[PDB]
Amino acid sequence: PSIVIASAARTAVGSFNGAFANTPAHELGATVISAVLERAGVAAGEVNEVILGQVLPAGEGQNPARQAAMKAGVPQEATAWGMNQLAGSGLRAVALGMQQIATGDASIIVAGGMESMSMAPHCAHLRGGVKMGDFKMIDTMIKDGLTDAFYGYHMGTTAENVAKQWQLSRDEQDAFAVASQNKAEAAQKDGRFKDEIVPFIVKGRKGDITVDADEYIRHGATLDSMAKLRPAFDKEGTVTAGNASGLNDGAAAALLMSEAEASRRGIQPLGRIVSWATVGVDPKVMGTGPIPASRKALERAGWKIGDLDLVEANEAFAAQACAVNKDLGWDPSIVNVNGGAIAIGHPIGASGARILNTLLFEMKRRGARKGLATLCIGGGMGVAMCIESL
Amino acid sequence: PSIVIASAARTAVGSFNGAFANTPAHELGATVISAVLERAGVAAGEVNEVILGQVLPAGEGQNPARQAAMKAGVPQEATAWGMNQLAGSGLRAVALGMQQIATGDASIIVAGGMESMSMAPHCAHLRGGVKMGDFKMIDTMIKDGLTDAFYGYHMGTTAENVAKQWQLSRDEQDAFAVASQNKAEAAQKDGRFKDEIVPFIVKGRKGDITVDADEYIRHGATLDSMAKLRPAFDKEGTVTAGNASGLNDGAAAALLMSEAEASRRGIQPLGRIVSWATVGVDPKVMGTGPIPASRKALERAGWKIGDLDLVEANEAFAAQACAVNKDLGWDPSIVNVNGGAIAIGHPIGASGARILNTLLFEMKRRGARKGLATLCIGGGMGVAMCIESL
Amino acid sequence: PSIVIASAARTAVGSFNGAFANTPAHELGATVISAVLERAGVAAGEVNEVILGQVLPAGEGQNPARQAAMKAGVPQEATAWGMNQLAGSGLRAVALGMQQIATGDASIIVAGGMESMSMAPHCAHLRGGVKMGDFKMIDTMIKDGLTDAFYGYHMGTTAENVAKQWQLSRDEQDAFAVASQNKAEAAQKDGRFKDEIVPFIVKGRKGDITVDADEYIRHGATLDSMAKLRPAFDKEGTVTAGNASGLNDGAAAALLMSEAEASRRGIQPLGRIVSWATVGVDPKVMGTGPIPASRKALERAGWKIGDLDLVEANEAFAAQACAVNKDLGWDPSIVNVNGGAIAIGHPIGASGARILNTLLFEMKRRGARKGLATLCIGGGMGVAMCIESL
Amino acid sequence: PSIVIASAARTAVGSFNGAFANTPAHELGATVISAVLERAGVAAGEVNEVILGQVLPAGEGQNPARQAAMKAGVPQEATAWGMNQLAGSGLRAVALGMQQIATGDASIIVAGGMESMSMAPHCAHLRGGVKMGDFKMIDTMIKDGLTDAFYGYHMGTTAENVAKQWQLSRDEQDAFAVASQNKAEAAQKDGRFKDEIVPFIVKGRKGDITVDADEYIRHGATLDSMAKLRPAFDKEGTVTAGNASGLNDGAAAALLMSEAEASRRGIQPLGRIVSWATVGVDPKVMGTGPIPASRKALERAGWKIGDLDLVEANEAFAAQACAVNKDLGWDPSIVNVNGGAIAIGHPIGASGARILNTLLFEMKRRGARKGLATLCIGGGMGVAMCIESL
C-alpha cells in the first residue's frame, strides 16, 4: 500500500493578535481543505474523512474539525475528527490519514492541522465555586500549549536545557535565528511561498482583507538586533524572543489517496509517503525528539541520512534546532532552505502540516527525490515522515 | 494482520460534581492504563503508544494523554496523543490503535478515553481587552461538548428532532429509561460490573476514599419517577433529564496487540477486532449516527445483523436509543444487557471505551462470540466496531 | 437639638455562604426598614431619607440604599445614599442621620447598615486587555473589606500587632472567645435576641425559609475547641479562626426623629443620642480605635466611664476586644452582656447598627439608663455613640 | 452657624482610558486634598476629616478616602470615609462636611469626590460556584454606575424618557451639545480652567506626564458631527454619544471651616454655604431631579430663581439639561458659562464637586454674589447647593 499526497495547501502564518486575530481556526481549516480539493480537482463529496490536529480548541464549539469540513462543503456523510500530539499534531494527522487508506477503511482523506493561538481564551474551573481568596484566570494557550505538565515550566526552558547539555552559545543561536530570517525573507521576495499558500479572506465590517503574506517574517534582519535582546526564560540565559519561534495562527493540509487512485484521476502527486515514526525522549529535553524520530522513519523507509536531498526541521527554538542539526549531521545547506518556524512562525497544531507543505512544493520546484519533515513535541516526543517525489 | 483486545478496564462512572468532582481526567486515565497493563501481564515499559479520546481538556495542561501515561508508569520513550470524535472518541481511539499495529508501526497500544466534565472550566477570549460592557464566561462542557456548532442548540434538542421523525412518544421514551435503570441496578448488585471496574482512590486532605461503584444509577427507578418531570430542552416536548443521560466523569481502555503477540505471552484476549466503521449523517438528527455505522461495520465483518449475540449501543437519549434499535431490528434483549448510559452515565470522551469494556466482559461472562459497539455523535456522526471472541 | 431612636431592628446575622448566601444586601435592608417603620408606628410615606452603610456593594447595582428603600415602599420623593467607614459604617450612618435632623434638613431618618459578604464578587481590571499569561481575579471581600491598604496584610495581622503590644496570651484570647460564644448561646436560648430580630423570609423556588435566629453562634463551644486551632495569620501567632469574628451577612437599622417629634406621635423611644465621636489611630493597631473614640464620646456627653450601665464593644478579634476593655477599664460584666461578634458574626457595614440594636434592647429590658456602643475600623479609626434612656 | 468654603481644587478631567487610564482614584483625590490645603494655607495636620464621594471603588482596597487622605499627609488621628449618592456624590459630601462643622463635631473638613471609571473592574459572584451554563463577567462601571436598578436600563434611556415627556427634539439636544463644547473650548483657551485645576503627575516608568488640561473637550465641534451620530440607546431615539456626557476620571474637593474660623486665619473664602437640598423624583425621569432640589435649595436660602447670578447645572444628558433649564426658567446665559459635562466629562462621584469648583472660581472671577450648583442622580434624585460670595 502506497499512499500519496495528491495536493497540498496552507494559509499564510499570521502573527499573534495579527492578521487572524479574530479568525476562528476552523475557518482557516475550511480554506485549506477547499484548496487541496480545488488543486487536485476532486469534489468535496468524494472526501471520506477530515483529520485536523488542533491543540487549542476551547470555546470553539463541538469538534471544530467537523466545523471546518462542513464550511468547505464536505458533505454531512463524511467524517471529521481532531487530535493532539502538541506540535507534531499537524504532521501526525497526515500519518493517521495515510493509515486510513492503507487499512482500506477510507479512499480519500484530507489531513493537516489548524491553530488559532490568538483566539485561545483564559479559563478557570469554577463549578465547586471559589469560597474565598484570589484565584488565577489561566491562559489556555500557555497552560495547554506551552507549559510542561511534569515540571511546570515553559518550553523555552526545555530548549535551554538543550543549550547547556550541547553547550550551544548565545552567539551560535543568533547565527541560526538571523539565518532563518534571511533565508525566509529571500524566499518571500522570490515568490517561493506563492504556490503553497492559499489566500484567506478575513471578513470585516468596514471591508474584507485578503491575506496572502506570512507576516511574522521580519524584513532585513541584522545580527545586532538579535544579540541585543534579553532572555525570556532564564535571567542568565540564552533563549530569547528572537532565537525562539513565535505564537501564531495558521492552517495547513494535504489531500491523500492511494497511488493507483491518483493516476486514475490524472493527478501528478507532490510525493509518496514511504515512512514515518514517533518516539519519546526525556521531557526536560523535548527538542531532541526530531533526532530519534528522524532515525526511525529513515530506518523504516530504508534510507540513510546522506541520501536526503531536502529537509524541514521545525525550528521551535534555535537551541533545539542546532542540536538536531549536529547529531544527525546532515548538510545544513538543505535544511530549512526557505527558512523555518523562527521566521515563518509556529502555529502549534498546524505547524507540522506547514513544513510538510513547504518541503513538498520546494521539492517539486528544485527536483529533490527524497524529503523529510520533523517536529519536536512538548512532553518529549519526536515525529517524522519520509517523502519521495515522483 | 488480526489484532486482539488482550485486556481492558474502566473506572466507575461518577455523577456530575460527585465522587470525582475534583479529579483531573488524566488521573482517572492513569488508573485504567495501569489496570490493563496488569490485567494482560505486560509491563508499562513495553508500551509503544497511548491513545486517549478526550473532548474537554481545557486547563488540564499539555496533552493529558501523555500525563496519564507518564503517571501510569509508561516510560518516556513511548508516545502519547489524544483525539476528539466527541462521544465516538473512546471507541475510535481503539480503532486508531488497531491501525498502528496493522500498519506495522506499533506492537502494543493502550487505547480508550477519559473525561472529567466536572473539571471542564468556563472560559473567555480576553486578549483584546474589554473596553466596556459585560462579557460571557463560557462553560466549555456546554459549548464544546453538548452544543451543535451549526444549529446552535443542545444535543437534547437533536433528540427532539429524532423523536419527532420516528414518532416516539413520551411514554415509550420513559419506558426505555426505566428499563435501562432497572437493568443497571440489577447488574450492579450482581457484580456484573466488578470485573471491568478497577477502583479509583480519590486522595484527600481528610481521608482517602475508594470508588468502586457507578453512583449515577438511581436505585428502583419507577415509571412514575420518570413520568413526573418536565421536558428539559423543548417546552412542549418529550425529552427530560430522566430519559436522557447525564453529565459524568470517568475513563476506560484496552491493550491491543497482534493475536500472535498475545499467544507468545499466554494472554487470553477479550476480543479480536474483526471490523470497524464511522459514518456521517445530518447534525439535526445526530442520534441516527449508529445506523449507517453499524451497517457498514457489519458489511466489513461479512456478518448479518442476526449473527450478533451481543450489542452495546450507547444511550445518549431514550429518543435516539429507541430509534436506532427500531431500524437495525436486532433483539433488544441482547442490547445494553447491563443497562446503558441513561443509568450508568455519559462521560463523553470516555463513553466509547466505557461501553466497549462492558461488551467485552459480558461477552466473556456469557460466552457470546459476536459483539458490536456503537455510539451516536454530535454534529452528525456514528462509530461502530465488531469484536469476536477467540 | 435632641434626637431619639424611636425604633430599631435587625435581621439575624447569617453565616458565610449560609442562610443568606444568595440574598442581596438591599433585600435584608428592605426588611429592617419595614420593621423600624412598623415598630414605631411610622408610615413609609413619612420617611425623608434612608442612609445605609455598606462596604461591599460591587455588582449589586446603582445605590443599594435606594434599592432597599424603594423595596420597603419608601416613596420616590425621599432620598437614599450609602457610605463606607468600614466596620464603623452602620454606627456612623446613625450619627449622620442624627445630623440631618439636628441641622433641620430632615424630620425622619432611617439609618444603619447592610452587608452581604457572601454575595461579594471576584473582580479584575480588564479594560487594557491582557496580552498574555495569567492574571488575578481579586476577592473584593478580602481586598476592599479585610486587607489594610497601607501595609498589604489582613486585619488579623493588626490583631497580632495588638496581641504583641498589649501582651495578650493565646489562652487569654481563647477564654474571651469562649465566653463570647457562651453568653451569646445563653442569650439566644433565653429569648434575648427576639425583640431586636425581625425575621427574614428567604424566597425559594422549592419553598420559602424564615430566618429568625443568629446561625453563627456555636452551641456548646469548648475551650479545647479554641485551644486546638492553628494561628490563622501568623505561624507563631496567637489569633485563630476561633478567636476572631467571622465573615457574615445581615442588616440593622434605627428610625430617628426629634425628641419633640416622638412626643407628638406618642412614641416611647429606645433612646436619646447623647453624643458620638470618631477618631483615628495607626492602621497597624486599628483594633485600638474604640479607646480614643469612646473617651471622646464620653467627654462630649459629660460622662465618666464609671457612669455607663451597658456597653457594646464590637468583637472584631479577641486580641483587640481585650486591649480595649483593659485600657478603658470598664466593668467587663456590663460589656457585651449577651455576647459579641466572635459568636454572632461580623457583617461589616451592618455591624455598627447591629450592636446598637443589641445595646438598645438590653437597655430597655434591664432598665439601664446610660449606654455606649463602639467599634474598631480598618485603616485605623474608631467610632462610638452614647445613648441615654428616656 | 455659618460654614465657608475656604478653598477648592480639581484635577483635569480625563478621557475614558485616556490620561488617567491606570491611576487609582485615591491618587487623584490625594492631589486635590494637597491642593485645597496649600491654597487655603492650612496644614494637613489640622484636618479633622476627609469625606469623598465615590461610586466605583471596587478593587481599590479598604476605604479609598482614607487612602487618599493618608497619601496627602493627613495624620492618622483624623478620619475619612466614602459615600455614594451617585452623581450627587461629590456635592452631597460637601453638604455632609458642612454638617460636621455645623453640629460642632469638626472644625476642618476636606470634602468632594473622586472617580476612576477607567479603573473600575469587571466582576462576578463565584462563591457558590457555577454548576453549569454560561455566566456574565459584569462591567461594574455599567452595572453599579450607569444602569437603573428598578428598570434595568441605562441612564441614557431615562434621558430619552425625558426627551419624550418635554418633547425635546434631536436638533435641540445637538444644539445644546455643540454649545457646551464650544463654550468649554473657549473657556479652556482663555485660561478660565487654570485657577480651578491642580496639575496631576501621572508617574511613569519611561517618564512622568503632567496633566493640567481637560482632555475630553473636543476642539472645533461641528453641528454636522453631532447630527450624523446614531442614537446610542433607542434605535428610533434622539440621545447619542455626542449629546450625552462621557465616561471620565477625575477628583475634586473643597476645604471647609466656619466663617468665624476663616476670619481668624485671615482667609478670603470662595463662598458661604447658604443652603442645600436633596429631593427624589421617579427613577424613569431621574434627569429632572435638579428641578425640585434647586427649588427646595432656593426656598431654604430665601432666594428667588431670578436672584441667582451664576449656575452650574450638570449636563449628564442634553435632553435633561434642557428640561431643567425649561422648567426652572433661569436665564440660560448664566448657566454653564464655561461649558458643562458634555464637553468636560462626567466622572460620576467626582462631578458634583467638579461643578462646584467651576461655579466658585467663575463666581470669583466675575464678582457674582449668588450661585447655585445642581445635579441629577440615577435612581431618581437631585441635589442642589446655594453659595454666596464674601
Ligand SMILES: CC(=O)CC(=O)SCCNC(=O)CCNC(=O)[C@H](O)C(C)(C)COP(=O)(O)OP(=O)(O)OC[C@H]1O[C@@H](n2cnc3c(N)ncnc32)[C@H](O)[C@@H]1OP(=O)(O)O
Ligand atoms: C473592616 C473593619 O473596619 C472592621 C474590623 O472590625 S476588622 C474585622 C473584620 N473581619 C475580619 O477580619 C474577619 C476575621 N475572620 C476571618 O478572616 C476568617 O473567618 C478566617 C480567615 C479567620 C478563617 O478562615 P476560613 O477559611 O473561613 O476557616 P473557617 O471555616 O471560618 O474555620 C476554620 C476551622 O475552624 C473551625 N472553627 C471556626 N470557629 C471556631 C470556633 N469558634 N471554635 C472552634 N472551631 C472553630 C471551623 O469549623 C473550621 O474547622 P474545619 O476546617 O475542620 O471544618
Ligand SMILES: CC(=O)CC(=O)SCCNC(=O)CCNC(=O)[C@H](O)C(C)(C)COP(=O)(O)OP(=O)(O)OC[C@H]1O[C@@H](n2cnc3c(N)ncnc32)[C@H](O)[C@@H]1OP(=O)(O)O
Ligand atoms: C449616575 C447618576 O447618578 C447621574 C447621572 O447623571 S447618569 C450620567 C452618567 N454617565 C452616563 O450615563 C454615560 C453616558 N455615555 C455613555 O454611556 C457612553 O459614552 C455612550 C454609550 C453614550 C457612548 O459610548 P461608546 O459606545 O464607547 O461610543 P463612543 O466611542 O463614546 O462614541 C461614538 C462616536 O461618537 C462620536 N462623537 C461624540 N461626540 C462627538 C462630536 N462632538 N463630534 C464628532 N463625533 C462625536 C465619536 O467620534 C465616536 O465615533 P467613532 O466610532 O469613529 O470613534
